[PDB]
Design an enzyme around this catalytic site. Structure first.
Site, short mmCIF file in Angstrom:
data_model
loop_
_atom_site.label_atom_id
_atom_site.label_comp_id
_atom_site.label_asym_id
_atom_site.label_seq_id
_atom_site.Cartn_x
_atom_site.Cartn_y
_atom_site.Cartn_z
N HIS A 40 -33.37 19.86 45.61
CA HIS A 40 -33.11 18.46 45.30
C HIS A 40 -32.21 18.31 44.06
O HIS A 40 -31.82 17.20 43.68
CB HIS A 40 -34.40 17.61 45.20
CG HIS A 40 -35.13 17.74 43.88
ND1 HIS A 40 -36.25 18.53 43.74
CD2 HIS A 40 -34.87 17.22 42.67
CE1 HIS A 40 -36.65 18.48 42.48
NE2 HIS A 40 -35.85 17.69 41.81
N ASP A 84 -38.13 23.32 48.91
CA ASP A 84 -37.30 22.85 47.81
C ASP A 84 -36.86 24.02 46.92
O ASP A 84 -37.38 24.22 45.82
CB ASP A 84 -38.09 21.82 46.99
CG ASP A 84 -37.22 21.07 46.00
OD1 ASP A 84 -35.98 21.08 46.12
OD2 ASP A 84 -37.79 20.44 45.08
N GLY A 175 -36.23 15.57 34.88
CA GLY A 175 -35.39 16.28 33.94
C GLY A 175 -35.79 17.75 33.89
O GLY A 175 -34.98 18.60 33.49
N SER A 177 -36.84 19.25 36.62
CA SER A 177 -36.55 19.70 37.98
C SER A 177 -35.82 21.04 38.06
O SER A 177 -34.86 21.26 37.33
CB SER A 177 -35.70 18.67 38.71
OG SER A 177 -36.43 17.50 39.03
N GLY A 178 -36.27 21.90 38.97
CA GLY A 178 -35.64 23.20 39.15
C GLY A 178 -36.07 24.24 38.15
O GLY A 178 -35.75 25.42 38.30
N1 LIG Z 1 -44.91 17.04 37.80
C1 LIG Z 1 -44.42 15.82 37.92
N2 LIG Z 1 -45.14 14.78 37.66
C2 LIG Z 1 -42.99 15.64 38.34
C3 LIG Z 1 -42.03 16.62 38.03
C4 LIG Z 1 -40.71 16.45 38.44
C5 LIG Z 1 -40.30 15.30 39.16
C6 LIG Z 1 -38.86 15.09 39.60
N3 LIG Z 1 -38.73 15.30 41.06
C7 LIG Z 1 -38.41 14.28 41.87
O1 LIG Z 1 -38.18 13.14 41.44
C8 LIG Z 1 -38.22 14.54 43.39
C9 LIG Z 1 -36.96 13.93 44.01
C10 LIG Z 1 -37.89 12.78 44.47
N4 LIG Z 1 -39.06 13.67 44.29
C11 LIG Z 1 -40.22 13.15 43.87
O2 LIG Z 1 -40.86 13.64 42.97
C12 LIG Z 1 -40.81 12.03 44.71
N5 LIG Z 1 -41.76 11.18 43.94
C13 LIG Z 1 -41.21 10.42 42.79
C14 LIG Z 1 -42.26 9.77 41.94
O3 LIG Z 1 -43.25 9.27 42.51
O4 LIG Z 1 -42.12 9.74 40.69
C15 LIG Z 1 -41.50 12.59 45.99
C16 LIG Z 1 -42.80 11.87 46.44
C17 LIG Z 1 -43.46 12.70 47.57
C18 LIG Z 1 -42.52 12.83 48.79
C19 LIG Z 1 -41.21 13.51 48.36
C20 LIG Z 1 -40.53 12.68 47.23
C21 LIG Z 1 -41.25 14.31 39.45
C22 LIG Z 1 -42.59 14.48 39.05
#
Ligand SMILES: N=C(N)c1ccc(CNC(=O)[C@@H]2CCN2C(=O)[C@H](NCC(=O)O)C2CCCCC2)cc1
Ligand SMILES: [Ca+2]
Length: 223
Positions: A40, A84, A175, A177-178
């Site tokens: 992503h 992912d 932020g 992510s990855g």
């Molecule tokens: N550990 C954590 N709390 C956490 C860490 C990193 C991230 C960043 N990643 C993202 O935004 C990615 C791309 C979309 N996805 C999400 O997290 C979405 N929720 C978004 C949401 O509900 O905030 C998810 C919800 C479940 C179905 C797939 C899309 C988000 C949460």
């Protein structure tokens, strides 16, 4: 990283910053020519920044190298975030030293209860927005599959695992992510998704790297 601590300059040598004019995702160096990140995070025109601590200040130990090619997992699903994971090849090999080092891939999947280190330059507020310039760290345990699934009914696959605290307060965030999730000296996960950040009963979800070791090894050997 919400509720974490400042790692300290170059204490996490395998951590990388994916930059497209600004930091947009983290990643892990697995050898001198390859970085593993999340699907992503995919983007065209990526520069990989290694040996970073403060991302807004040149401190002297950085290595800025462009990506020559990106390979998103063949079965990646952008709707559910299943599979992912993405591989990034550097145009030139990075110089490995004390401050820039690779992380080993797992020989098996870790058990629940295992403590892991998660790191990143993401948001530090659970309800708000405040981005740090220095790398943040968080120690968190891998949760049982039941806890993970109870939190996200019908959304967890065998390619995912939960880590963090059901009470909230500490978690990865946007932020990060990855970025890496290292347990027992092995890269066990990749910061993937969740609901908000650090919310009660909404733990972070991570890509289960142990299931992709074969794909990683064969892909890098053929590219
Ligand atoms: N550990 C954590 N709390 C956490 C860490 C990193 C991230 C960043 N990643 C993202 O935004 C990615 C791309 C979309 N996805 C999400 O997290 C979405 N929720 C978004 C949401 O509900 O905030 C998810 C919800 C479940 C179905 C797939 C899309 C988000 C949460
Ligand atoms: Ca810097």
């Amino acid at each position: 990283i919400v509720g974490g601590y400042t790692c300290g300059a170059n204490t996490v040598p395998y951590q990388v910053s994916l930059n497209s004019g600004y930091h947009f995702c983290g990643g892990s160096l697995i050898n001198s020519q390859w970085v593993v990140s999340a699907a992503h995070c995919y983007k065209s025109g990526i520069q990989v920044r290694l040996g970073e601590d403060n991302i807004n200040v040149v401190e002297g130990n950085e290595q800025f190298i462009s990506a020559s090619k990106s390979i998103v997992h063949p079965s990646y699903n952008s709707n559910t975030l299943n599979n992912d994971i993405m591989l990034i090849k550097l145009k030139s090999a990075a110089s490995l030293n004390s401050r820039v080092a690779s992380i080993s891939l797992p020989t098996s999947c870790a058990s629940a209860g295992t403590q892991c280190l998660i790191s990143g330059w993401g948001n530090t507020k659970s309800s708000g927005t405040s981005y740090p310039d220095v790398l943040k760290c968080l120690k968190a345990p891998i949760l049982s599959d039941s806890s993970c699934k109870s939190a996200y009914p019908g959304q967890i696959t065998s390619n995912m695992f939960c880590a963090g605290y059901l009470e909230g307060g500490k978690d990865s965030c946007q932020g990060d992510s990855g970025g890496p999730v290292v347990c027992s000296g092995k890269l066990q996960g990749i910061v993937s998704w969740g609901s908000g950040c650090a919310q009660k009963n909404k733990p972070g979800v991570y890509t289960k790297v142990c299931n992709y070791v074969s794909w990683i090894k064969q892909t890098i050997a053929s590219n």
